Amino acid sequence: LEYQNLFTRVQVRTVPEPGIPIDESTGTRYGTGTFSYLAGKFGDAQIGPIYLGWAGVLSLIFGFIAIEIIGLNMWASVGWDPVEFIRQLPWLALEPPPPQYGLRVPPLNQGGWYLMAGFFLTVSIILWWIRIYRRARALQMGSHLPWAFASAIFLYSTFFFQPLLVGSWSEMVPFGIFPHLDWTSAFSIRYGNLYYNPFHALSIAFLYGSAVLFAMHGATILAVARMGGEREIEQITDRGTAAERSMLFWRWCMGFNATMESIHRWAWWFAVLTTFTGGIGILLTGTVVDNWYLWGVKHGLVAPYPAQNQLTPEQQDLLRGRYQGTAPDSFPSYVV
Amino acid sequence: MMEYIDGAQIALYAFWLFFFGLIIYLRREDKREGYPLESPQGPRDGWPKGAPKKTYVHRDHG
Amino acid sequence: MHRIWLMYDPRRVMVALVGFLAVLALVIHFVLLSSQRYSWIENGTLGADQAPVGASAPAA
Amino acid sequence: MHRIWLMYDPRRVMVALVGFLAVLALVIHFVLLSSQRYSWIENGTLGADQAPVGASAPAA
Amino acid sequence: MHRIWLMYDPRRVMVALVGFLAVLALVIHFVLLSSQRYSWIENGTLGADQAPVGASAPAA
Amino acid sequence: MHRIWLMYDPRRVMVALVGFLAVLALVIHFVLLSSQRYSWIENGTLGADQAPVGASAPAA
Amino acid sequence: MHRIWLMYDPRRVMVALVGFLAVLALVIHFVLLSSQRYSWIENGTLGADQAPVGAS
Amino acid sequence: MHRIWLMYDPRRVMVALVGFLAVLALVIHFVLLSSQRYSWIENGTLGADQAPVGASAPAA
Amino acid sequence: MHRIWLMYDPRRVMVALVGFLAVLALVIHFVLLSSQRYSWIENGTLGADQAPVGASAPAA
Amino acid sequence: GMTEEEARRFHGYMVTGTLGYVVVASVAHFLAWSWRPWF
Amino acid sequence: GMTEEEARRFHGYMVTGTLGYVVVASVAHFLAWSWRPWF
Amino acid sequence: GMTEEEARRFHGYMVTGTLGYVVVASVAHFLAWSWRPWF
Amino acid sequence: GMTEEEARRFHGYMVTGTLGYVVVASVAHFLAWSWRPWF
Amino acid sequence: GMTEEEARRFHGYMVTGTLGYVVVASVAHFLAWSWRPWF
Amino acid sequence: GMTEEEARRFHGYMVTGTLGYVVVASVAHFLAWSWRPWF
Amino acid sequence: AMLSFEKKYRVRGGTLIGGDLFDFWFGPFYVGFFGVTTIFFVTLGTLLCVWGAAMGPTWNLWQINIAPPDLKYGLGLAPLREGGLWQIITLCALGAFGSWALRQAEIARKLGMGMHIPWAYGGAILAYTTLVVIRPFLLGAWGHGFPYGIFSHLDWVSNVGYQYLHFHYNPAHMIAVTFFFTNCLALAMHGSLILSVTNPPKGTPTGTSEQENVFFRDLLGYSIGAIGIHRLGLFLAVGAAVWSAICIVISGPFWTQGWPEWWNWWLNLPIWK
Amino acid sequence: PVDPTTGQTLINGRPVVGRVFIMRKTDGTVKYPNVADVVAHEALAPLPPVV
Numbered sequence A: 001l002e003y004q005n006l007f008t009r010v011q012v013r014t015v016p017e018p019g020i021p022i023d024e025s026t027g028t029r030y031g032t033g034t035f036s037y038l039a040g041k042f043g044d045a046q047i048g049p050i051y052l053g054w055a056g057v058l059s060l061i062f063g064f065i066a067i068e069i070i071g072l073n074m075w076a077s078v079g080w081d082p083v084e085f086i087r088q089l090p091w092l093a094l095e096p097p098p099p100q101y102g103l104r105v106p107p108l109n110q111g112g113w114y115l116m117a118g119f120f121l122t123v124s125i126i127l128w129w130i131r132i133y134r135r136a137r138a139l140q141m142g143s144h145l146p147w148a149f150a151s152a153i154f155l156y157s158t159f160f161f162q163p164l165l166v167g168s169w170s171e172m173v174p175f176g177i178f179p180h181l182d183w184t185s186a187f188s189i190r191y192g193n194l195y196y197n198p199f200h201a202l203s204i205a206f207l208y209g210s211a212v213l214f215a216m217h218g219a220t221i222l223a224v225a226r227m228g229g230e231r232e233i234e235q236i237t238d239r240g241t242a243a244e245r246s247m248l249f250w251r252w253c254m255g256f257n258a259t260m261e262s263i264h265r266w267a268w269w270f271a272v273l274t275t276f277t278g279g280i281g282i283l284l285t286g287t288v289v290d291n292w293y294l295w296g297v298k299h300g301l302v303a304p305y306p307a308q309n310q311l312t313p314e315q316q317d318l319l320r321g322r323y324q325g326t327a328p329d330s331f332p333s334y335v336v
Numbered sequence B: 001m002m003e004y005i006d007g008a009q010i011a012l013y014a015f016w017l018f019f020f021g022l023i024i025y026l027r028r029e030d031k032r033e034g035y036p037l038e039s040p041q042g043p044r045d046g047w048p049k050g051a052p053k054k055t056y057v058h059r060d061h062g
Numbered sequence C, D, E, F, H, I: 001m002h003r004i005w006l007m008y009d010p011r012r013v014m015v016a017l018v019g020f021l022a023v024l025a026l027v028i029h030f031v032l033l034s035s036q037r038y039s040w041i042e043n044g045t046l047g048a049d050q051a052p053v054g055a056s057a058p059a060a
Numbered sequence G: 001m002h003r004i005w006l007m008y009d010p011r012r013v014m015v016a017l018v019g020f021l022a023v024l025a026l027v028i029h030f031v032l033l034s035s036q037r038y039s040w041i042e043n044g045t046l047g048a049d050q051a052p053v054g055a056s
Numbered sequence J, K, L, M, N, O: 001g002m003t004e005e006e007a008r009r010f011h012g013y014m015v016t017g018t019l020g021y022v023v024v025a026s027v028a029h030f031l032a033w034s035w036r037p038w039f
Numbered sequence P: 001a002m003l004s005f006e007k008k009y010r011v012r013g014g015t016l017i018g019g020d021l022f023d024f025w026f027g028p029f030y031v032g033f034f035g036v037t038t039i040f041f042v043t044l045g046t047l048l049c050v051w052g053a054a055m056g057p058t059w060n061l062w063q064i065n066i067a068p069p070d071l072k073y074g075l076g077l078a079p080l081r082e083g084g085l086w087q088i089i090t091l092c093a094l095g096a097f098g099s100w101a102l103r104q105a106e107i108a109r110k111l112g113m114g115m116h117i118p119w120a121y122g123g124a125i126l127a128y129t130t131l132v133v134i135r136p137f138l139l140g141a142w143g144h145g146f147p148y149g150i151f152s153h154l155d156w157v158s159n160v161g162y163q164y165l166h167f168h169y170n171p172a173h174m175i176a177v178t179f180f181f182t183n184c185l186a187l188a189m190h191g192s193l194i195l196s197v198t199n200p201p202k203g204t205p206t207g208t209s210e211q212e213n214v215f216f217r218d219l220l221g222y223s224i225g226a227i228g229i230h231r232l233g234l235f236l237a238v239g240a241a242v243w244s245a246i247c248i249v250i251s252g253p254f255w256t257q258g259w260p261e262w263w264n265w266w267l268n269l270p271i272w273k
Numbered sequence Q: 001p002v003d004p005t006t007g008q009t010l011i012n013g014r015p016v017v018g019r020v021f022i023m024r025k026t027d028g029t030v031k032y033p034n035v036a037d038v039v040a041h042e043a044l045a046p047l048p049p050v051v
């Protein structure tokens, strides 16, 4: 019943909408500001003009062609049927090359479009990084954001380098909603349960810690927003009672605290380390360790359970299978 | 030819040394406000000792 | 040489040094203890010619 | 060497030293207690000739 | 020797000491209680000649 | 020895004491109830000649 | 002996005490209720010589 | 006796009481309904000698 | 050349240099320790004629 | 808060409330016992 | 803050209530012991 | 804050409460021993 | 903080109590050793 | 901070405590050695 | 911050302590080599 | 010890239970009645975890495994060495987490803060309570809870997922994952922005809310604003835990088949059946 | 061994008052020593692919 600061009953509007302050060359602001009533009820109201420059324009051209290649291959895979393109959409994929090609260029239908879409997507992501970096400099800001984004790009690039290091493009992630989840599950199966990869475990701890911190910090700032705690830059340069009370809450709760500035460093590192430890864990997989559960047995991670079955010595020879080979390329008659 | 030592383990201790270094750095940053602590036995710094309080240059006029 | 201690505070360097030597010593001891040849807590009483040795080059 | 106590507050150094020694002692005891040869809570009453020894290099 | 209590508030040392001794004692009891030889709740009535002993090194 | 009550607030030493004893009592009862020899709720009516005794394997 | 109520306001003790005893009584009943010998909801009619004994 | 209602707000104690009794009544009915002997919605029409009973101790 | 110390603070450079050298040395040592040829803790005593060598044959 | 006479009259209802509740429960237990006794 | 005669008055009730509870609990154990002894 | 007089008074109850508790505990242990010795 | 006279007085209790605790523990090890020696 | 005479005084205890500790550890190692040598 | 004469006094302790440490470590390698040479 | 500004805040009052009785600090920590109950349950639960390690096969931290009972025990307490200990530790956990949230409410009331932090933590408690209370209750046996062990509980997560053949296809799980990933992205942007205006390149003036607002608006096309980003971060982080609770409670109690075949309703919409 | 006189277990030749059971850790679980030991309880390694 006490006002919760979750919703704003009274917005105000300025007849002019703010523009961009400085450094308009090699690129210019597109559009002009407008106000959204819904966005203005969640948060701030101005849907703005936007900046691209050279890097942003090129990023969109490369990224459009990548997405266009993905979609057209998906749509071709249901025979151009537009009803099936929508009905089956999350099952559709643009799929990596066949394994026996290794790193060679594959046929166009058999993964040649995949590598082309993957190349343009990668260039598009790098140009978008350059855009963000240039824009941070032009606004006279620190480069904290482009290095945060570089950590995500690092994990993304391991989905290129680990297939390269194991020596086959067939090991790459298919472009598709459910297909890339099929790949994600099968990758953990092939490499013997990724739960025992310790860099995967670290990445999870930082993924969970990022949710812990944004829950704690989000709730903390809303609990003092009645005192201007959300004006964080002002609280950092001119500590008010809102900053003092949020420091004391955590000190009295758990025995130590951050500051209004340094809480944002904790946030930054927990997010960044999620994808950085993740990338390392991928790059070790199939290159250094091929069965993570057995690595866990070696290093003492695996809890012992009582045996569910016991094999006789002849069953140990009978129940070994074969490694999976090639599919049969003929349709046998059994007539004789 | 080391049987027990392997690259995944080597990487993991490399990370632990960085991470414990990082926690120290963050706990130094966390003490730029409110420290040194008041105590009936005089000032206290905790550990690590905090980084000094920053002074912020305001935008000259606008 | 001594002017290094004007560029750096000896209070910081000495704690950095102690921390470095602590970590380095523990790394070398635990690497050795994990080896076969120098797992001295299990095999320290073996004489030098009885202690494990890694396998030679293959011979055929 | 007593002027090390003018570089560093002895009240802080002693807490750090007590902390260091406690952690180190517990580490070494737990290393030994994990071993075979020095699993003394189970095999402490064995004679020195009877205690486990880790395997030697095999003879040619 | 008593000037140690000018340096440290005895009111804080006694808290630290009681905390340390409490955890240490619980550690040692649970370690022993997890052992085979000193699992005294199940086996405490056995004579010392009857109590478990860990494996010897085999002679050859 | 009564100076303890000058160093520490008796209102909350006594809360700490009652808390500590309650935790300790519950731990010991749950430990004994986990055992075989002292699962009194199910085997409490057995005489000492019937009561379980733990031993190691006969090691023939 | 009465001076503990000058240290502890009795109205604030008695609410705490009731909670502790309510939980303790519930815990003890459930420990018994799912033991073999004292699962009285299902074997309460047996009589003392027929009731289970945890021998093994 | 009535000075209990001078110590505590009667309104609060009535809400506390009714909440406890409602939850307690629900728990006991669920425990009975979840049992074999008292699963009355399915077996309530059985006579007192045909309602389930939990097994006795063995004869030896 | 010394203008390098005017462009960059030597205090900042020295940390970067020592950091680079320490990492590079640790990388090279563990790469050699992971090899067969140079796994010196296990096989350092072998002597150069019987130290491992990587496979020759391009063919035949 | 409340006056000691107002406390006095409230207590009489709380007592007779508790008594009427116990009475119904006691009859309910005797009915349950007559249908399927538990000892 | 409570006066010493108020504390003394409460203490008499608090002792008597505790001991009455313990007496009732002892009778409950006597019935439980008679029905199914645990030693 | 309590005086050394009050501290001495309080300590007397604390000692006799401890002793009374230790006595009850020791009787409980001797009952437990005679029922089922642990050594 | 404390006077040096107060430091001397506390040190007397602290050393005495520490050694008393070590004496009780040394007897506990005498008994434990007699029952089941660990070397 | 300390005055240098206090630093001089404290060091003498610190050295003696370090010596006393190393001595006890030296006996502990020679007991351990004669029980079960590690070389 | 230090005067140059303080830096010079510190430097000689720091050098001596480093060389002292390296001397002790040299004996440790002499002992380790005598027990089990790594080449 | 106290922060240099702290002392004037250390007033009495704001408790929910106990009043002045426990209204004091111990070092940095506020105690209170729920502090006392916190320490009780934490201590009892932790020592019973150590007891679980002692009677199990190893002291190796990664391998300790205090497992729930067999399903045959249903909703009863099992024998303590057969999973009843896991049940007692679970009660301590519920008591400790509940005491922690109520102690947070007492601290917030003492500082004149809104109740946002206790309720945000309630999201995590809801997920834990779903895993060990609600879902096992709906399945009719406490043995459906996860074991207490650093890696053995990951074995439980693996096996529960494959009980539904392909757990990625669980629709609430897809939403929960999307919240977790979106939260981590949003946290990196919020951290970066505040740091980059407060720590600009050397010789640049300190930034402003306007610069932060302009840059953010080039990233997403719209201004979120200062309170908006903290609302978003709270919505994302707590929504992730709530959708996690949903995704696990529907798995078993409500859906029993493989998760891929749940999507059959989408394939059979009448416009394209 | 059991004493024929009294039906009573003898440990190291001397009697035990009680009902002797062999102590084991929870459910008889035993820590995995090695990868080799884990692999020794498994089937042999799979045969090579048919390509």
Ligand SMILES: CCCCCCCCCCCCCC(=O)OC[C@H](COP(=O)(O)OCC(O)COP(=O)(O)OC[C@@H](COC(=O)CCCCCCCCCCCCC)OC(=O)CCCCCCCCCCCCC)OC(=O)CCCCCCCCCCCCC
Residues within 6 Å of the ligand: A205, A209, A254, A255, A256, B020, B021, B023, B024, B027, B044, B045, B046, B047, B048, P001, P002, P026, P027, P028
């Ligand atoms: C998994 C990936 C993600 C995992 C993510 C994990 C993130 C964890 C981040 C938080 C960890 C630090 C917590 C903290 O700072 O608490 C304050 C306390 C004291 O310093 P202060 O606050 O500045 O000053 C107050 C004090 O000086 C005087 O206060 P007062 O007189 O009122 O009270 C008495 C004293 C007594 O001191 C203590 O009791 C300290 C005991 C600390 C033990 C726990 C250390 C955990 C380290 C974890 C990092 C790592 C260790 C290896 O002060 C207090 O009572 C303070 C009570 C603080 C209670 C904090 C409890 C935190 C438990 C965290 C457990 C985390 C488990 C994961 O700090 C410390 O004692 C030292 C902590 C130093 C930072 C850790 C750096 C470790 C680097 C590696 C070892 C370095 C060796 C040289």
Ligand code: BCL
Residues within 6 Å of the ligand: A067, A070, A121, A125, A152, A153, A155, A156, A175, A183, A184, A185, A186, A187, A188, A193, A194, A195, A199, A200, A203, A204, A205, A207, A274, A275, A277, A278, A279, A281, A282, P157, P181, P184
């Ligand atoms: C059966 C399934 C396996 C499994 C298999 C894997 C695999 C395989 C991987 C992970 C990875 C991760 N897993 Mg796992 N995982 C399992 C179980 C779990 C559980 C759980 C509760 O059980 C959790 C919480 C997690 C959690 C996590 C994360 C910590 C981690 C991903 C970090 C990240 O931010 O990625 C999300 C962030 C990114 C992908 C970065 C992307 C950034 C780029 C720049 C974005 C480009 C967008 C572009 C511009 C536009 C695209 C347009 C379209 C192409 C049309 N896993 C089990 C054991 N998991 C990853 C990892 O790091 O492993 C070590 C990984 O690769």
Ligand SMILES: CC[C@H]1c2cc3[nH]c4c(c3C)C(=O)[C@H](C(=O)OC)c4c3nc(cc4[nH]c(cc(n2)[C@@H]1C)c(C(C)=O)c4C)[C@@H](C)[C@@H]3CCC(=O)OC/C=C(\C)CCC[C@H](C)CCC[C@H](C)CCCC(C)C
Residues within 6 Å of the ligand: A057, A059, A060, A061, A062, A063, A064, A067, A124, A125, A128, A129, A132, A145, A148, A149, A151, A152, A271, A272, A274, A275, P181, P182, P184, P185, P188, P189, P219, P220
């Ligand atoms: C720290 C780790 C976390 C993280 C961080 C992170 N990601 C980031 C950032 C950061 C800090 C950015 O700054 C960056 C960003 O821009 O954020 C808004 C980004 C980003 N994170 C993204 C996604 C993303 N992040 C993810 C994850 C995470 N990101 C981690 C959890 C995931 C997951 C979980 O899978 C995804 C999918 C993007 C939204 C964004 C990078 C955008 C980008 O690179 O876009 C390149 C451009 C294209 C793909 C092309 C789009 C084309 C359109 C169809 C328009 C076509 C118009 C026209 C036809 C062509 C042009 C014509 C010309 C004539 C004009």
Ligand SMILES: CC[C@H]1c2cc3[nH]c4c(c3C)C(=O)[C@H](C(=O)OC)c4c3nc(cc4[nH]c(cc(n2)[C@@H]1C)c(C(C)=O)c4C)[C@@H](C)[C@@H]3CCC(=O)OC/C=C(\C)CCC[C@H](C)CCC[C@H](C)CCCC(C)C
Residues within 6 Å of the ligand: A208, A211, A212, A215, A216, A219, A253, A254, P038, P041, P042, P043, P044, P045, P046, P049, P089, P092, P093, P096, P097, P100, P117, P118, P120, P121, P122, P123, P124, P147, P148, P149, P150, P151, P153, P237, P238, P240, P241
């Ligand atoms: C709801 C969104 C996310 C969230 C938010 C969140 N967590 C929070 C908060 C908030 C808002 C707090 O205010 C609170 C806090 O104070 O943080 C510092 C907290 C907190 N989140 C924590 C952890 C945590 N949060 C997690 C998750 C999440 N927290 C969600 C994703 C996880 C995960 C996913 O694994 C963990 C481990 C704590 C640091 C803290 C709550 C501290 C607390 O309750 O303290 C009292 C209890 C103890 C100190 C110990 C209790 C010990 C038990 C009695 C015995 C052990 C039993 C246990 C079940 C064993 C488990 C073994 C495992 C190996 C399985």
Ligand SMILES: *[C@H]1O[C@H](CO)[C@@H](O[C@@H]2O[C@@H](C)[C@H](O)[C@@H](O)[C@H]2O)[C@H](O)[C@@H]1O[C@H]1O[C@H](C(=O)O)[C@@H](O[C@H]2O[C@H](CO)[C@@H](O)[C@H](O)[C@H]2NC(C)=O)[C@H](OC(C)=O)[C@H]1OC(C)=O
Residues within 6 Å of the ligand: A325, A326, A327, A328, A329, A330, A331, A332, A333, A334, Q050, Q051
């Ligand atoms: C058609 O041919 C393909 C390709 O050989 C067969 O698939 C093989 O077997 C599968 C196990 C595997 O998945 C696949 O990679 C591939 O190895 C497929 O089963 C059909 O087989 C029949 O025809 C085979 C063929 O290739 O002609 C024939 O194989 C035999 O004959 C050829 C030619 O004379 C000879 O080169 C092969 O070595 C020989 N193989 C064997 C194993 O004897 C199959 O005959 C037999 C006995 O296998 C055909 O199979 C049947 C049942 O008719």
Ligand SMILES: COC(C)(C)C/C=C/C(C)=C/C=C/C(C=O)=C/C=C/C(C)=C/C=C/C=C(C)/C=C/C=C(\C)CC/C=C(C)/C=C/C=C(\C)C(=O)O
Residues within 6 Å of the ligand: G025, G026, G029, G030, G033, H014, H017, H021, H024, H027, H028, H031, J006, J009, J010, J013, J014, J016, J017, J018, J021
């Ligand atoms: C599975 O088996 C397990 C479960 C495990 C086994 C364990 C079981 C356990 C441990 C059980 C515990 C039971 C228990 C305690 O411990 C039980 C305690 C029960 C009690 C105390 C019940 C009290 C009931 C009282 C009632 C209904 C009152 C009714 C009427 C009222 C109030 C008056 C209405 C009129 C008003 C208000 C107006 C007055 C005038 C006014 C205001 C005016 O005039 O001003």
Ligand SMILES: COC(C)(C)C/C=C/C(C)=C/C=C/C(C=O)=C/C=C/C(C)=C/C=C/C=C(C)/C=C/C=C(\C)CC/C=C(C)/C=C/C=C(\C)C(=O)O
Residues within 6 Å of the ligand: F025, F026, F029, F030, G021, G027, G028, G031, H001, H003, H004, H007, K009, K010, K013, K014, K016, K017, K018, K021
């Ligand atoms: C599975 O097996 C495991 C569980 C593991 C085995 C182990 C179990 C363990 C360890 C158990 C420990 C138990 C324990 C330990 O101490 C239990 C302790 C129990 C205790 C202390 C109970 C005390 C009860 C006290 C009562 C009921 C008092 C009532 C008072 C009343 C009614 C009057 C109040 C005053 C009034 C109304 C004033 C009116 C006048 C006024 C105001 C005026 O006149 O002004």
Ligand SMILES: COC(C)(C)C/C=C/C(C)=C/C=C/C(C=O)=C/C=C/C(C)=C/C=C/C=C(C)/C=C/C=C(\C)CC/C=C(C)/C=C/C=C(\C)C(=O)O
Residues within 6 Å of the ligand: E025, E026, E029, E030, F021, F024, F027, F028, F031, G001, G003, G004, G007, L006, L009, L010, L013, L014, L016, L017, L018, L021
């Ligand atoms: C099985 O495995 C594991 C568990 C691992 C094995 C190991 C276990 C271990 C290590 C156990 C350690 C146990 C231990 C160690 O020390 C145990 C030590 C216990 C102790 C010290 C108990 C002391 C109890 C004292 C009591 C009850 C006193 C009560 C006082 C009362 C009632 C009086 C109240 C009235 C007053 C004051 C008067 C007010 C007047 C006023 C105000 C006035 O006049 O003003």
Ligand SMILES: COC(C)(C)C/C=C/C(C)=C/C=C/C(C=O)=C/C=C/C(C)=C/C=C/C=C(C)/C=C/C=C(\C)CC/C=C(C)/C=C/C=C(\C)C(=O)O
Residues within 6 Å of the ligand: C025, C026, C029, C030, C033, D024, D027, D028, D031, E001, E003, E004, E007, N006, N009, N010, N013, N014, N016, N017, N018, N021
């Ligand atoms: C995998 O490897 C594995 C297996 C782990 C193996 C490898 C292990 C390794 C690498 C070990 C390294 C060990 C090491 C390295 O340096 C260890 C170094 C240890 C050291 C330095 C110990 C020093 C101890 C000193 C003590 C105890 C001093 C006590 C002093 C006292 C009591 C007096 C205090 C003062 C008083 C009372 C006076 C007050 C007066 C005042 C105030 C006044 O007058 O004002």
Ligand SMILES: COC(C)(C)C/C=C/C(C)=C/C=C/C(C=O)=C/C=C/C(C)=C/C=C/C=C(C)/C=C/C=C(\C)CC/C=C(C)/C=C/C=C(\C)C(=O)O
Residues within 6 Å of the ligand: C017, C024, C027, C028, C031, D001, D003, D004, D007, I025, I026, I029, I030, I033, O009, O010, O013, O014, O016, O017, O018, O019, O021
């Ligand atoms: C597994 O195998 C892998 C790991 C793979 C193999 C590879 C390993 C590698 C790469 C190793 C690299 C090692 C290395 C590289 O640099 C190692 C370098 C080590 C170094 C530099 C050691 C230096 C030690 C210096 C010491 C101890 C100094 C002590 C000084 C003292 C005591 C005096 C203090 C001052 C005082 C007392 C003055 C007070 C008075 C004052 C102030 C007054 O009076 O004012």
Ligand SMILES: COC(C)(C)C/C=C/C(C)=C/C=C/C(C)=C/C=C/C(C)=C/C=C\C=C(C)\C=C\C=C(C)\C=C\C=C(C)\C=C\CC(C)(C)OC
Residues within 6 Å of the ligand: A067, A068, A070, A071, A072, A075, A115, A116, A118, A119, A122, A156, A157, A159, A160, A172, A173, A174, A175, A176, A177, A180
């Ligand atoms: C008409 O227009 C239409 C209607 C078709 C437009 C609509 C399009 C639609 C509907 C598109 C739908 C797209 C969807 C649903 C896409 C889903 C994508 C997902 C979920 C992808 C998930 C993961 C993908 C990953 C991780 C891919 C990673 C690939 C990498 C890193 C590839 C790198 C490749 C390189 C660098 C290639 C280099 C080229 C070589 C090797 C040859 O030379 C250097």
Ligand SMILES: CCCCCCCCCCCCO[C@@H]1O[C@H](CO)[C@@H](O[C@H]2O[C@H](CO)[C@@H](O)[C@H](O)[C@H]2O)[C@H](O)[C@H]1O
Residues within 6 Å of the ligand: O008, O009, O010, O011, O012, O013, O016, O017, O019, O020, O021, O023, O024
């Ligand atoms: C096995 C151990 C081998 C030796 C270990 C190393 C420590 C040796 C200490 C005893 C030998 C003398 O060591 C010597 O001490 C003197 C003071 O006493 C130090 O001298 C230091 O303080 C004096 C003033 O007091 C300054 O003038 C001098 O410039 C400064 O270095 C020397 O730097 C150190 O070299």
Ligand SMILES: [Fe+3]
Residues within 6 Å of the ligand: A217, A221, A232, A264, P190, P194
């Ligand atoms: Fe913020």
